[PDB]
Amino acid sequence: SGFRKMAFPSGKVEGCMVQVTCGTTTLNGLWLDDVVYCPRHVICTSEDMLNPNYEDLLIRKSNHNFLVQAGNVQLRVIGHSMQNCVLKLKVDTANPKTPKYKFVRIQPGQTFSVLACYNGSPSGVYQCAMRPNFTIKGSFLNGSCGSVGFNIDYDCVSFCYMHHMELPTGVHAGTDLEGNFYGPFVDRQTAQAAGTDTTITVNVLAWLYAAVINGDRWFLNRFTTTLNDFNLVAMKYNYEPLTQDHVDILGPLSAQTGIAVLDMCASLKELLQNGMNGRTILGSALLEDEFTPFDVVRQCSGVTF
Residues annotated catalytic, as ranges: 41, 145
Chain breaks in the chain (C to N over 2.5 A) after: none
Cα dihedral across residues 259, 235, 294, 226: positive or negative: positive
Nearest approach, Cβ of residue 106 and a second copy (Å): 18
Choose from a second copy, ligand RW9, Cl ion, none: what does 106 bind? Cβ within 5-8 Å by kind.
Cl ion
Phi, psi angle pair for 123, to nearest 5°? -110, -30
* AA identity, residue 270: E
Choose from ligand RW9, a second copy, Cl ion, none: what does 63 bind? Cβ within 5-8 Å by kind.
none
Q: How many C-beta atoms lie closer than 10 Å to residue 68's C-beta? A: 21
**Contact status: 137 vs ligand RW9 (CB under 6 A):** no
Q: Which of 24, 46, 107, 301 binds Cl ion (CB under 5 A)?
A: 107
* Stretch near ligand RW9 under the rule CB under 6 A, chosen from 10-18, 87-95, 187-195, 252-260: 187-195
SS3 48: helix
Q: Which of 45, 93, 214, 224 binds a second copy (CB under 8 A)?
A: 214
**Contact status: 71 vs a second copy (CB under 8 A):** no
Choose from ligand RW9, Cl ion, a second copy, none: what does 171 bind? Cβ within 5-8 Å by kind.
a second copy
**Cβ pair 20, 29 in contact under 8 A:** yes
Nearer Cβ to ligand RW9 (165/250): 165
**Contact status: 269 vs ligand RW9 (CB under 6 A):** no
**Contact status: 134 vs ligand RW9 (CB under 6 A):** no
Choose from a second copy, Cl ion, ligand RW9, none: what does 110 bind? Cβ within 5-8 Å by kind.
Cl ion
Beta bridge partners of 67: 21
How far apart are alpha carbons 62 and 98 in whole angstroms?
A: 26
| Binding map of a second copy across residues 111-140, x = CB under 8 A, - = no contact | ----xxxxx-xxxxxx-x--------xxxx
Size of interface with ligand RW9, in residues (CB under 6 A): 14
* AA identity, residue 1: S
Give Cβ neighbours of residue 82 (< 8 Å, ≥ 6 apart): 40, 54, 55, 58, 88, 179
Q: Which of 49, 58, 82, 106 binds Cl ion (CB under 5 A)?
A: 106
Beta bridge partners of 111: 129
Residue 115's nearest CA partner among 26, 20, 11, 6 is 11
Nearest approach, Cβ of residue 49 and ligand RW9 (Å): 6
**Contact status: 244 vs Cl ion (CB under 5 A):** no
Choose from a second copy, ligand RW9, Cl ion, none: what does 187 bind? Cβ within 5-8 Å by kind.
ligand RW9
| Binding map of ligand RW9 across residues 144-173, x = CB under 6 A, - = no contact | xx------------------xxx-------
User: What DSSP string runs through 190-231?
Assistant: S---PPPP-B-HHHHHHHHHHHHHTT--TT--S----HHHHH
SS3 165: strand
Query: CA-based angle 291:293:298, to the nearest 5?
Result: 85
Put residue 238 in one of left, alpha, beta given phi > 0 → left and psi -120 to 50 → alpha.
Answer: left
Residues lying near ligand RW9 in the complex (CB under 6 A) = 1, 41, 49, 140-142, 144-145, 164-166, 187-189
Residues lying near a second copy in the complex (CB under 8 A) = 1-12, 14-15, 115-119, 121-126, 128, 137-141, 143-144, 166, 170-172, 214-215, 280, 283-286, 298-305
Residues lying near Cl ion in the complex (CB under 5 A) = 106-107, 110
